[PDB]
From a paper:
The asymmetric unit contains two protein molecules (monomer A and B) and one double-stranded (ds) DNA molecule (14bp, strands C and D). Monomer A and B have a virtually identical conformation with an RMS derivation of only 0.7 Å for their main chains. Both of them comprise a discontinuous, anti-parallel β-barrel structure (β1–6) packed against a loosely associated bundle of four α helices (A–D) with the topology of secondary structures elements arranged in the order β1-β2-β3-β4-αA-αB-β5-β6-αC-αD. In monomer B, the C-terminus was turned towards the N-terminus and located close to the DNA binding site, whereas the residues from 121–128 in monomer A were located further from the DNA binding site. In the complex, the MCB–DNA adopts a right-handed B-DNA. However, in the MCB–DNA as compared with the ideal B-DNA, major groove is narrower and the minor groove wider. The structure reveals that the wing (80-loop), helix B, the 20-loop and helix A are important for MCB–DNA binding and notably, that the wing and helix B recognize the minor groove and major groove of the DNA respectively. The conserved Glu-X-Gly-X-Gly-X-X-Glu (QXGXGXXQ) motif in the 80-loop is located in the minor groove of DNA and contains the residues that make the majority of protein-base interactions with the MCB–DNA. Three types of interactions are observed in this interface. These include the side chain of Q89 that makes hydrogen bonds with the N2 and N3 of dG3 and the side chain of Q82 that is hydrogen bonded to the O2 of dC4 and the N3 of dG5. In contrast with most wHTH structures, helix B is not the main mediator of DNA binding with only two residues (K62 and R65) making contacts with a base and a phosphate of the MCB–DNA. Interface-1, formed in complex A, comprises a larger buried area than interface-2 in complex B (1729.4 Å2 versus 1330.0 Å2) and contains many more hydrogen bonds (26 versus 8) suggesting that there is a greater degree of specificity and affinity in the monomer-A interaction over the monomer-B interaction with DNA.
Author numbering:
A (entry chain B), B (entry chain A): 14 to 33, 36 to 128
Write the structure that this text describes.
DNA sequence: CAATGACGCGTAAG
DNA sequence: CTTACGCGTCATTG
């Protein structure tokens, strides 16, 4: 049962769309920035192909590299509009649309143990 | 035997004090910042112990966290005087004396912002 | 050129 | 306490 959950990493509240069931995509609560590494990962790209596209394409624009600390939070972060376009271009939007069409009130529930 | 060596990791020149002979403490050449994680490892502290010390004490001052890259370079980096203070507070300055007292000659770098 | 396992850090969760 | 996580270098391979 895929769904959007609340989580906090290094004091940073995020929305975590769980699906797969072990796959996930994170969106920040404060600025709605999304993890582009998660998106490319959902598109089926392996590690070298991901490092390639991130270096060559994604990081040519406004972005934030996160190299610490918790693994699942790490990656390259970009504005939501940039992440949505990246998902559409890699034909992965249908698997990812809940995290893009999410408009929160208070507040998303905690994840599973 | 145990002594000071000069290495380069990810294009970053450091001074490295080796002893054990597998233990080490790195001091950066460009700003004399020292690896606080190496220091606490030189003391008897294991992972959760130094995790608490780094988070509750060391991180509350001027610091830089490094994850990824060459493994042994990783850790929490702090200015040299803060490193000397930390080494004293945790009763390990004497064993690590050469990495604090080493001097190439002319001349030490100023306090970074 | 590209791939990939080792490394080991800061974090999180059991 | 224990494990799990993913990253970016380095050495090594094809």
């Amino acid at each position: 049962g895929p769904g959007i959950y609340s989580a906090t990493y290094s004091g940073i509240p995020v929305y975590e769309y769980q699906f797969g069931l072990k796959e996930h995509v994170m969106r920040r609560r404060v600025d709605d920035w999304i993890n582009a590494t998660h998106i490319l990962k959902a598109a089926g790209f392996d590690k070298p192909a991901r490092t390639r596209i991130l270096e060559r394409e994604v990081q040519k624009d406004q972005h934030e590299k996160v190299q610490g600390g918790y693994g699942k939070y790490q990656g390259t972060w970009i504005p939501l509009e940039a992440g949505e376009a990246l998902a559409h271009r890699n034909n992965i939007f249908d698997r990812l649309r809940p995290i893009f069409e999410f408009s929160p009130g208070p507040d998303s529930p905690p994840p599973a143990p």
